[PDB]
mmCIF file of C-alpha atoms and ligand atoms in Angstrom:
data_model
loop_
_atom_site.group_PDB
_atom_site.id
_atom_site.type_symbol
_atom_site.label_atom_id
_atom_site.label_comp_id
_atom_site.label_asym_id
_atom_site.label_seq_id
_atom_site.Cartn_x
_atom_site.Cartn_y
_atom_site.Cartn_z
ATOM 1 C CA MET A 1 8.006 3.449 1.506
ATOM 2 C CA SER A 2 6.554 2.506 4.477
ATOM 3 C CA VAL A 3 2.981 4.560 4.400
ATOM 4 C CA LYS A 4 1.590 6.387 7.695
ATOM 5 C CA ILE A 5 -1.628 4.985 7.683
ATOM 6 C CA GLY A 6 -4.728 8.718 8.574
ATOM 7 C CA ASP A 7 -2.472 11.110 7.000
ATOM 8 C CA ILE A 8 -3.844 11.621 3.991
ATOM 9 C CA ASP A 9 -3.042 14.887 3.663
ATOM 10 C CA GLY A 10 0.613 14.440 3.377
ATOM 11 C CA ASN A 11 1.342 16.606 5.838
ATOM 12 C CA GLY A 12 2.434 13.979 8.490
ATOM 13 C CA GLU A 13 -0.598 14.487 10.887
ATOM 14 C CA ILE A 14 -3.933 12.697 11.675
ATOM 15 C CA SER A 15 -6.021 15.695 11.486
ATOM 16 C CA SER A 16 -10.251 16.362 9.809
ATOM 17 C CA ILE A 17 -8.433 17.722 6.917
ATOM 18 C CA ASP A 18 -7.742 14.494 5.780
ATOM 19 C CA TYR A 19 -11.325 12.571 7.040
ATOM 20 C CA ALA A 20 -11.991 15.193 4.472
ATOM 21 C CA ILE A 21 -9.979 13.968 1.607
ATOM 22 C CA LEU A 22 -10.350 10.462 2.942
ATOM 23 C CA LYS A 23 -14.382 10.705 2.872
ATOM 24 C CA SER A 24 -14.190 12.268 -1.308
ATOM 25 C CA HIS A 25 -12.308 9.631 -2.545
ATOM 26 C CA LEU A 26 -15.244 6.807 -1.106
ATOM 27 C CA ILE A 27 -17.977 9.640 -2.189
ATOM 28 C CA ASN A 28 -16.549 10.003 -6.271
ATOM 29 C CA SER A 29 -12.685 10.950 -6.346
ATOM 30 C CA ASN A 30 -9.920 8.756 -6.989
ATOM 31 C CA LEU A 31 -6.253 9.387 -5.473
ATOM 32 C CA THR A 32 -3.110 8.135 -5.623
ATOM 33 C CA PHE A 33 -2.480 4.804 -4.806
ATOM 34 C CA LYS A 34 0.417 5.881 -2.016
ATOM 35 C CA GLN A 35 -3.156 8.087 -0.620
ATOM 36 C CA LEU A 36 -5.142 5.020 -1.092
ATOM 37 C CA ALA A 37 -2.720 3.383 1.075
ATOM 38 C CA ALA A 38 -2.711 5.699 3.799
ATOM 39 C CA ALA A 39 -7.069 5.932 4.023
ATOM 40 C CA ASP A 40 -6.169 2.052 4.429
ATOM 41 C CA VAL A 41 -6.914 2.013 8.688
ATOM 42 C CA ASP A 42 -8.253 -1.655 9.111
ATOM 43 C CA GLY A 43 -5.833 -3.264 7.444
ATOM 44 C CA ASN A 44 -7.951 -4.678 4.831
ATOM 45 C CA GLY A 45 -6.494 -2.974 1.767
ATOM 46 C CA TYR A 46 -9.304 -2.197 0.597
ATOM 47 C CA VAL A 47 -10.676 1.452 1.112
ATOM 48 C CA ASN A 48 -14.033 0.762 3.009
ATOM 49 C CA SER A 49 -16.595 3.284 4.391
ATOM 50 C CA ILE A 50 -15.694 1.588 7.505
ATOM 51 C CA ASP A 51 -12.321 3.368 7.571
ATOM 52 C CA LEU A 52 -13.229 6.703 7.138
ATOM 53 C CA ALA A 53 -15.630 5.613 9.852
ATOM 54 C CA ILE A 54 -12.818 4.900 11.905
ATOM 55 C CA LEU A 55 -10.645 7.869 11.006
ATOM 56 C CA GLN A 56 -13.515 9.743 12.130
ATOM 57 C CA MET A 57 -13.683 7.781 15.319
ATOM 58 C CA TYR A 58 -9.456 8.118 16.142
ATOM 59 C CA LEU A 59 -10.365 12.103 15.544
ATOM 60 C CA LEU A 60 -13.926 12.174 17.806
ATOM 61 C CA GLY A 61 -12.965 10.474 20.222
ATOM 62 C CA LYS A 62 -14.050 7.583 19.781
ATOM 63 C CA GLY A 63 -11.739 5.081 19.908
ATOM 64 C CA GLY A 64 -9.322 4.638 16.837
ATOM 65 C CA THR A 65 -7.579 1.224 17.225
ATOM 66 C CA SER A 66 -7.146 0.987 13.449
ATOM 67 C CA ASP A 67 -3.132 1.414 12.167
ATOM 68 C CA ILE A 68 -3.675 5.255 12.557
ATOM 69 C CA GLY A 69 -0.898 7.917 13.253
ATOM 70 C CA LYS A 70 1.764 4.070 12.586
ATOM 71 C CA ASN A 71 2.897 3.594 9.423
ATOM 72 C CA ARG A 72 1.790 0.775 6.521
ATOM 73 C CA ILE A 73 5.362 -0.770 6.990
ATOM 74 C CA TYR A 74 4.323 -3.935 3.650
ATOM 75 C CA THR A 75 6.831 -5.682 2.504
ATOM 76 C CA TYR A 76 6.884 -4.082 -1.286
ATOM 77 C CA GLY A 77 6.081 -6.060 -3.873
ATOM 78 C CA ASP A 78 3.784 -8.139 -1.690
ATOM 79 C CA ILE A 79 0.774 -7.384 -2.781
ATOM 80 C CA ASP A 80 -0.792 -9.332 0.154
ATOM 81 C CA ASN A 81 1.333 -8.879 2.552
ATOM 82 C CA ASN A 82 2.128 -11.669 4.292
ATOM 83 C CA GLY A 83 6.193 -11.692 4.723
ATOM 84 C CA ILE A 84 7.125 -12.811 1.192
ATOM 85 C CA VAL A 85 7.154 -11.701 -2.499
ATOM 86 C CA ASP A 86 6.248 -14.290 -3.752
ATOM 87 C CA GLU A 87 4.437 -15.634 -7.220
ATOM 88 C CA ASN A 88 1.202 -15.334 -6.089
ATOM 89 C CA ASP A 89 1.537 -11.164 -5.647
ATOM 90 C CA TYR A 90 3.410 -11.330 -9.268
ATOM 91 C CA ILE A 91 0.213 -12.825 -9.752
ATOM 92 C CA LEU A 92 -1.922 -10.043 -9.129
ATOM 93 C CA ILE A 93 0.179 -7.355 -11.148
ATOM 94 C CA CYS A 94 0.276 -9.431 -14.214
ATOM 95 C CA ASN A 95 -3.770 -9.772 -13.229
ATOM 96 C CA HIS A 96 -4.121 -5.793 -12.868
ATOM 97 C CA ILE A 97 -2.760 -5.352 -16.361
ATOM 98 C CA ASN A 98 -5.155 -8.119 -17.488
ATOM 99 C CA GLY A 99 -8.402 -7.100 -15.826
ATOM 100 C CA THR A 100 -8.962 -10.135 -14.737
ATOM 101 C CA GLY A 101 -8.436 -9.307 -10.700
ATOM 102 C CA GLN A 102 -8.904 -6.531 -8.147
ATOM 103 C CA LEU A 103 -6.224 -5.473 -6.621
ATOM 104 C CA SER A 104 -7.212 -3.454 -3.505
ATOM 105 C CA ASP A 105 -6.580 0.638 -3.329
ATOM 106 C CA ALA A 106 -4.216 -0.249 -0.510
ATOM 107 C CA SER A 107 -3.077 -3.969 -2.782
ATOM 108 C CA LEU A 108 -2.205 -0.906 -5.488
ATOM 109 C CA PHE A 109 0.097 0.609 -3.527
ATOM 110 C CA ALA A 110 1.743 -2.280 -2.347
ATOM 111 C CA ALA A 111 2.504 -3.538 -6.386
ATOM 112 C CA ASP A 112 3.683 -0.376 -6.862
ATOM 113 C CA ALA A 113 6.915 -1.493 -6.601
ATOM 114 C CA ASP A 114 8.658 1.851 -9.146
ATOM 115 C CA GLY A 115 6.923 4.266 -6.612
ATOM 116 C CA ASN A 116 5.066 5.957 -10.089
ATOM 117 C CA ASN A 117 0.947 5.536 -7.999
ATOM 118 C CA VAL A 118 -0.085 3.526 -11.760
ATOM 119 C CA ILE A 119 0.145 -0.302 -11.234
ATOM 120 C CA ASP A 120 1.332 -0.694 -14.414
ATOM 121 C CA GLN A 121 3.555 -3.245 -16.877
ATOM 122 C CA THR A 122 6.909 -2.203 -15.506
ATOM 123 C CA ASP A 123 5.743 -3.491 -11.587
ATOM 124 C CA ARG A 124 5.498 -7.393 -13.557
ATOM 125 C CA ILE A 125 9.463 -6.330 -14.817
ATOM 126 C CA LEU A 126 10.018 -5.337 -11.242
ATOM 127 C CA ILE A 127 8.765 -7.868 -9.760
ATOM 128 C CA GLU A 128 10.461 -10.263 -12.334
ATOM 129 C CA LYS A 129 13.666 -8.748 -11.761
ATOM 130 C CA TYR A 130 13.123 -8.550 -7.502
ATOM 131 C CA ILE A 131 12.013 -12.549 -7.384
ATOM 132 C CA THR A 132 14.814 -13.846 -9.533
ATOM 133 C CA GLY A 133 17.181 -11.966 -7.505
ATOM 134 C CA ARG A 134 18.876 -9.234 -10.326
ATOM 135 C CA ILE A 135 17.329 -6.755 -8.367
ATOM 136 C CA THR A 136 17.735 -5.967 -4.219
ATOM 137 C CA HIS A 137 16.210 -2.436 -4.204
ATOM 138 C CA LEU A 138 12.243 -1.001 -5.604
ATOM 139 C CA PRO A 139 11.787 1.929 -6.490
ATOM 140 C CA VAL A 140 9.673 1.322 -3.674
ATOM 141 C CA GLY A 141 11.429 -0.125 -1.541
ATOM 142 C CA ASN A 142 13.143 -3.420 0.456
ATOM 143 C CA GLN A 143 12.345 -6.124 2.315
ATOM 144 C CA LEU A 144 15.778 -8.511 1.780
ATOM 145 C CA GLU A 145 17.361 -5.875 4.421
ATOM 146 C CA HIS A 146 15.926 -6.623 7.260
ATOM 147 C CA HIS A 147 17.717 -4.894 9.464
ATOM 148 C CA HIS A 148 18.006 -8.055 12.103
ATOM 149 C CA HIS A 149 19.679 -10.147 10.172
ATOM 150 C CA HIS A 150 21.042 -7.508 7.555
ATOM 151 C CA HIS A 151 22.907 -10.356 5.264
HETATM 152 CA CA1 CA B 1 -3.292 15.238 8.244
HETATM 153 CA CA1 CA B 2 -9.392 -1.247 4.755
HETATM 154 CA CA1 CA B 3 2.802 -12.691 -1.115
HETATM 155 CA CA1 CA B 4 3.703 1.501 -11.260
#
C-alpha cells in the first residue's frame, strides 16, 4: 500500500521513536520490507545513513526535504518505480530469487506483490499474472485503477 515515509514505528506520526528503529537497521538489524520502504525517505530506494540524518533533520527542525510525512506511492509491482509494472521489474524479482541481483530496501517492499515482506517466488508469479492481465489486483495493491481514468 502507499507507505508513510518517516513513520518507522507504525503509529502513524513522525516521531523520535521512528529514528531509534531506523538507526538500529543501519547499525545492525533488519526490519520488515514495509519498514524498509518507510525508511527510505530520500526515495533512492536504499536505506542509507543519509535517510536517518534527514529524518533527524526533520525531527530537529533543520529541514527534512524528503518524503517524510508523505506517502510513498510506488507503483505496485514496479520495483524501479517508473510508473509501469514492466518486464524489467519482473527481472528484478527473479534476480533476488537467483541471488544474482540485489534490490534496494524500499524496492524489496515494492517488489513484494503478496505483502508478506519477503521476496519469494510467489511475487514473481503474481507479477507473471499481473503483466499478462490475469490478475487485476495484487495483494499489495494495483495501478490498473488510476482514479482519473479508472478504465
Ligand atoms: Ca512514529
Ligand atoms: Ca534513501
Ligand atoms: Ca518498472
Ligand atoms: Ca512475497
